[PDB]
Amino acid sequence: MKVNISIFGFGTVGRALAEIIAEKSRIFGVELNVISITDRSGTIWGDFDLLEAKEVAESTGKLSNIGDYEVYNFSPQELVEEVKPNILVDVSSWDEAHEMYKVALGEGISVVTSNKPPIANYYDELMNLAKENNAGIFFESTVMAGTPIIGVLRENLLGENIKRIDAVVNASTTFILTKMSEGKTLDDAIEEAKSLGILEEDPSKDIDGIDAYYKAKILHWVSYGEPPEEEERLGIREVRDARNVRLVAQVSKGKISVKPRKLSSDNPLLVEGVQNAAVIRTNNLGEVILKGPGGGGRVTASGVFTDIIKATLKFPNLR
Amino acid sequence: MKVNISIFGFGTVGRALAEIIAEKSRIFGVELNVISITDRSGTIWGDFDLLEAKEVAESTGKLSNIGDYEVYNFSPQELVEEVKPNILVDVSSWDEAHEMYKVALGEGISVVTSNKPPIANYYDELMNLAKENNAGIFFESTVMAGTPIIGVLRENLLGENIKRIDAVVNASTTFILTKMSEGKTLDDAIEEAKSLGILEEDPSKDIDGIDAYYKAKILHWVSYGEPPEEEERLGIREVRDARNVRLVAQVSKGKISVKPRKLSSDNPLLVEGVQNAAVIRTNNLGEVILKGPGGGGRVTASGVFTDIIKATLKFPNLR
Ligand SMILES: NC(=O)C1=CN([C@@H]2O[C@H](COP(=O)(O)OP(=O)(O)OC[C@H]3O[C@@H](n4cnc5c(N)ncnc54)[C@H](OP(=O)(O)O)[C@@H]3O)[C@@H](O)[C@H]2O)C=CC1
Ligand SMILES: NC(=O)C1=CN([C@@H]2O[C@H](COP(=O)(O)OP(=O)(O)OC[C@H]3O[C@@H](n4cnc5c(N)ncnc54)[C@H](OP(=O)(O)O)[C@@H]3O)[C@@H](O)[C@H]2O)C=CC1
Ligand SMILES: N[C@@H](CCO)C(=O)O
Ligand SMILES: N[C@@H](CCO)C(=O)O
Ligand code: NA
Ligand code: NA
């Protein structure tokens, strides 16, 4: 069977995804065909070579330069309405992308994304809409990227009661905390990280706990099927003694709390360097621990590719 | 969506499964209906209360002792043919149950199991049969029990090439090796383990690496879709220095090797207690680490329940 895929967004994650798809376009009795790609500059739509498009975007930073394919100025809504892919893959930084998803799901087009806010903020509407149009929504790389914590929660532990999830999901903050442990001030450590590309020049999504908050919210959705009643979002700006501290996202029924935690040397949450980690507590299993990378092009595109296959094959969305 | 389930075997695992099915009989749009339970004493079949049957077997030791249901003495083939369930659940210690699986699958009856040898030895025949009869096969609790290593490998990482897997999958051997580490002889360590509940009167399959080898073989099937060419099995009996040693299953394309390995102090495979672990190495993610309990009744039944749901909902088997 053949499936048509519109990729929406084409930055680090989207370009890595094109590689993965190109290397594995025929797999699991499926053929993956990318019929469109979109960035801010525009949309290409037709018979283009996927790695060729990646190359030209890699050098030039836009889809315009492609030889002999020509650009279309579609709105998100037009792109879906006109291209009519079977699968819409959002790998963009467009926070307000839920409106585009609504349209796609209306036409029974499944959505795959790595873009958090639409899932964190509109999870319920999007799920209902999906079920109503014999379609699916997939978001694995919205949490710990390619490391399959969403698979584990969504499609497994199906007889468990999840009492708690704790997770360290920002490598940058483990870096900052480690430097502080070694005697640097927070502000120095931040300066080091920004100059290293570990942090952005606006570091708030890491330092103020916002990325983790969105990830806690998504986890809360999957595990409990409703928005939380209680929210506590904090970052690391108040940390003084940073020994054995990590920025931890904790999820329990009706509660999300992102904040710094001092951890025993024993704790698998006490991750080193760039490693992310999640400890899931259940009634029958005690702790299940999952660790892996939390970012990177190929790492993130890995999750999305898993989701493309599931969408194509219409895997049930149970949670 | 109502589903009819035959449970084959009723020991620690099957009795704990009963508990779980009773508390969660309606979930995810499914009504789970248990129509037959079978042990060596024979087979009950009908309108019987699930927890009651658990209760009589609990105390008495057999199934025959129930009220208002004649026990039938059915062979495995007769059980499938006469009961006609939608899903056959094997939680027995019968090494040769694959022949029964072949029957069910032939009738489009899906199979869920925690029983290792049939999957280790007949996985391809079983997958081909299931495919030809619009049926599935699920075996999560054959490796690390409820700890969902199978879900992770089988239904996720779908864009990955699995470079390797290292795993410690026998809590019993951890205990033994730890005790040898502290000065105890093999035999004294074994006797302590028995007294603790940690080993059976025949520990041989765990001690000699046959269990792990079965497990390694299952992981190899999931990851590469064929048997290995190189096979090495070595148990713990003859370890002279057990310091920081575990019984590690190593899996790579074409290759399985179970043997005691000395590990660094920070190695995640350096597990304690009941805990099992798998370190999965893939081309895009590097290391994914999954840990959790490896045995126990409710732990093992958790994985089987997950599989029951997926069989009922016709989850794809991509690997
Ligand atoms: N990098 C990582 O490790 C991870 C990233 N993610 C998430 O995946 C998404 C992509 O990440 P990443 O690839 O690093 O980000 P990049 O900034 O590298 O790429 C973002 C892409 O989206 C495009 N875009 C942004 N807004 C719009 C819009 N309104 N319409 C059309 N296109 C738009 C960008 O266009 P332009 O360049 O033209 O502005 C660019 O092509 C993000 O939401 C991120 O949070 C998730 C997990 C890991
Ligand atoms: N417990 C654990 O931690 C784990 C177990 N498993 C596996 O799950 C399975 C169940 O283990 P568990 O419940 O602990 O073991 P038990 O020995 O407690 O139960 C085994 C069951 O199988 C029955 N049985 C064996 N052979 C036959 C047969 N030919 N016909 C009918 N019934 C039969 C037994 O009957 P009788 O008592 O009458 O002999 C018993 O009810 C095993 O294959 C085991 O390897 C896998 C992972 C973890
Ligand atoms: N490595 C990222 C996670 C990407 O979703 C961060 O914590 O900011
Ligand atoms: N962890 C268990 C494995 C049972 O499948 C043991 O020690 O045998
Ligand atoms: Na993920
Ligand atoms: Na398992």
Author numbering:
A (entry chain B), B (entry chain A): 1 to 319
Q: Any passages from the paper?
A:
Homoserine dehydrogenase (HseDH, EC 1.1.1.3) is a key enzyme in the biosynthetic pathway from aspartate to homoserine (Hse), which is a common precursor for the synthesis of three amino acids, methionine, threonine and isoleucine in plants and microorganisms. The third enzyme in the pathway, HseDH, catalyzes the NAD(P)H-dependent reduction of Asa to Hse. In the present study, we expressed that gene, which encoded a HseDH homolog, characterized the enzyme produced and revealed the enzyme to be a highly thermostable HseDH. Each monomer consisted of three domains: a nucleotide-binding domain (residues 1–139 and 297–315), a dimerization domain (140–160 and 266–293) and a substrate-binding domain (residues 161–265).
To reduce the number of these interactions, we constructed R40A and K57A mutants, which had striking effects on the enzymes reactivity against NADP. The model of the Hse-bound K57A mutant was refined at a resolution of 2.43 Å. The model of the dimer contained the ordered residues (1–319) in each subunit, two NADPH molecules, two Hse molecules, two Na atoms and 211 water molecules. The O atom of the C4 hydroxyl group interacts with the side-chains of Lys116 and Lys215 and, via another water molecule (W6), with the backbone N atoms of Met144 and Ala145 and the backbone O atom of Gly294. The C4 atom of Hse is situated in front of the C4 atom of the nicotinamide ring, which enables hydride transfer between the two. In K57A mutant, however, the C2 phosphate group is rotated in a clockwise direction around C2B of NADPH by about 30° relative to the wild-type structure.
